[PDB]
Design a protein around this ligand. Structure first.
Ligand code: WPN
Ligand code: WPN
Ligand code: CL
Ligand code: CL
Ligand code: CL
Ligand code: CL
Ligand code: MG
Ligand code: MG
Ligand code: MG
Ligand code: MG
Ligand code: MG
Ligand code: MG
Ligand code: MG
Ligand code: MG
Lengths: 10, 229, 229, 10
C-alpha cells in the first residue's frame, strides 16, 4: 500500500 | 521540433484524438508541440498536457518499481542493466516536462490558477526524479521539488479557496512528497489533516464546474491519513 | 541491429523482465534480437515472441479502430491524418514480424508444432494488415493470409491431435479470418463447429501441460458460434 | 461485439 497522489481525470 | 509545421489548433485536436485512442505518447508529443507555439494554455489544454505526461511517466514509474523490486530481491547484470534503461527513459521524460515548464509555461504573469498548477507540476516531476535518484543529484532534486511545491502553496493559500482542486491536488501531492521522499510523516500528516479540515470548514466554496474533482481529492486526503495512522 | 552486441541468453532474460514490467515494446525488441541470433526458438521463447508482438499490435489495432470510427462518423484533415499515422505504424510492426518469420523462423525443418505456429503467426499478421488495407494491396494481402493459414491447417491435421492448442488457436484464427476478412460466415461457422466437435470427440488427447489452453480455445470457439448464430 | 481470436496467455 503506497501513498495516493493526484489522479488523472477528464 | 517534429510538430513545428502543424497548426496549434490541429495539435490540440490531435491530442484529444490521441487521448480517445489511449495513445498517450502521441498525445504528449502533440501537447508539447502546442506548448512550443509560445501561447498560454487554457484550463482544458492544461488538462490534456497533464493527462498525457502523467500517463507516460506513470507507466515508466510502475515499470521501474517492478524491476527495482526484482533487483533488490536478488540481493548477472541483466536486471540492473534493464532497470537502468527504464530509469534513463523516465528521467528523459521528466527532463522534457521540466524544460517545457521553465522554457515556456511558468511565468510571473497569468492568473494564479495557471501559476499554481505549473509549479505543482514542476514539484511533481522533480519528485519523480527523486524517486530514482541517489547521491549529489538526490539531495538537490529534493530541494528543487520542495521549493517548487512551497511557492505553489504560498500562492494557492493567498489566491484560491480551500476547496479549489489545484489547491487540493497540490496539497495532496506535497504531503506525499513529505511522507515518501522527505521522510517526514508528521509534516505530511499535518499538511493532509489541515488541508482536509480547511476544505470541510469552507465546504461552501465548492465550484459548480469542479466540485467532483474537489471531493475526490478530499477523499484521497482521508485515505492517506488512514494509511498513515 | 540494436541488440546485436547482447548475448542471446541475456536477451531472453530481459524479454521476461520486460513482460513482468508490462514493457511490451522493449519485450518485442529483445525477442527480435534473440531471433536474429539465428537459432531456433523453444516453446517458452515462442510464447514470449508471440505475447510481445501481439500486445504491441493489439494496442495499435484498438487505436486504429477508435480513430477509424471517429473518421467515418464525421462523414478538417486531422482525424484522417492521425488515423493514417497510426495505420503506418501498425503496418510497420506487421512488416517487422513478417520479416522475422520469412528471414529466420519459418523453415522446412523443425517439428510440426513450430512450423504450424509460425505459419499461423504469418497468417495472423497478414490478417492485421488486411484489416487496414484497401486496393491492389488488399486483394493480395488476403490471399497471403489465407495461403499461410491453409498450409498451417494441412500440417496441423496431419501431425497434431485435435485438442492441441496451436491447432485449436490456428483454427480459431482462420475462422475469424473467414468471418471478418473474407466475408464467408458459412465457411467460418463450418470451420469453428468442426474444430470444436472434433476436439470434443477426441477430448482424451488433452495434454497435462497445456489442457487449460486447449479448453480456453474450445470455449472461445463456442462463443464465436453463439455470436454467429 | 467482435469475433474473438486467440488471446495472450502465460
Ligand atoms: C483548469 C486548469 O487550470 N487545469 C486543469 C488542471 C488539471 C490537473 N490539475 S491537478 O493535477 O491539480 C488535479 C486536481 C484534481 C484532480 Br481529481 C485531478 C487533477 C487540476 C487543474
Ligand atoms: C510451445 C510453443 O510452440 N509455443 C507456445 C505458443 C504460444 C502461442 N500459441 S497460440 O497463439 O496458438 C495460442 C493458443 C492458445 C492460447 Br490459450 C494462447 C495462444 C500456442 C503455442
Ligand atoms: Cl537493457
Ligand atoms: Cl501570490
Ligand atoms: Cl498526425
Ligand atoms: Cl506435414
Ligand atoms: Mg514552427
Ligand atoms: Mg500555430
Ligand atoms: Mg543468491
Ligand atoms: Mg543507475
Ligand atoms: Mg551480432
Ligand atoms: Mg548470443
Ligand atoms: Mg457534417
Ligand atoms: Mg491511408
Amino acid at each position: 500500500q503506497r501513498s495516493t497522489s493526484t489522479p488523472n481525470v477528464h | 521540433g517534429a510538430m513545428g509545421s502543424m497548426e496549434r489548433a490541429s495539435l490540440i485536436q490531435k491530442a484529444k484524438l490521441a487521448e480517445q485512442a489511449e495513445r498517450y505518447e502521441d498525445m504528449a508529443a502533440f501537447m508539447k508541440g502546442a506548448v512550443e507555439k509560445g501561447e498560454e494554455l487554457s484550463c482544458e489544454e492544461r488538462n490534456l498536457l497533464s493527462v498525457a505526461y502523467k500517463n507516460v511517466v506513470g507507466g515508466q514509474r510502475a515499470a521501474w518499481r517492478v524491476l527495482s523490486s526484482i533487483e533488490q530481491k536478488s540481493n548477472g547484470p541483466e536486471v540492473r542493466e534493464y532497470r537502468e534503461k527504464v530509469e534513463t527513459e523516465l528521467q528523459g521524460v521528466c527532463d522534457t516536462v521540466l524544460g517545457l515548464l521553465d522554457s515556456h509555461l511558468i511565468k510571473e504573469a497569468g492568473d494564479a490558477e495557471s501559476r499554481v498548477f505549473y509549479l505543482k507540476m514542476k514539484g511533481d516531476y522533480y519528485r519523480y526524479l527523486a524517486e530514482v535518484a541517489t547521491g549529489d543529484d538526490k539531495k538537490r532534486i529534493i530541494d528543487s521539488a520542495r521549493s517548487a511545491y512551497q511557492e505553489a502553496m504560498d500562492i494557492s493559500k493567498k489566491e484560491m479557496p480551500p476547496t479549489n482542486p489545484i489547491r487540493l491536488g497540490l496539497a495532496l501531492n506535497f504531503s506525499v512528497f513529505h511522507y515518501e521522499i522527505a521522510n517526514s510523516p508528521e509534516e505530511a500528516i499535518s499538511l493532509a489533516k489541515t488541508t482536509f479540515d480547511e476544505a470541510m470548514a469552507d465546504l461552501h466554496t465548492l465550484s459548480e464546474d469542479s466540485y467532483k474533482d474537489s471531493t475526490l481529492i478530499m477523499q484521497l486526503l482521508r485515505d492517506n491519513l488512514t494509511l498513515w495512522t
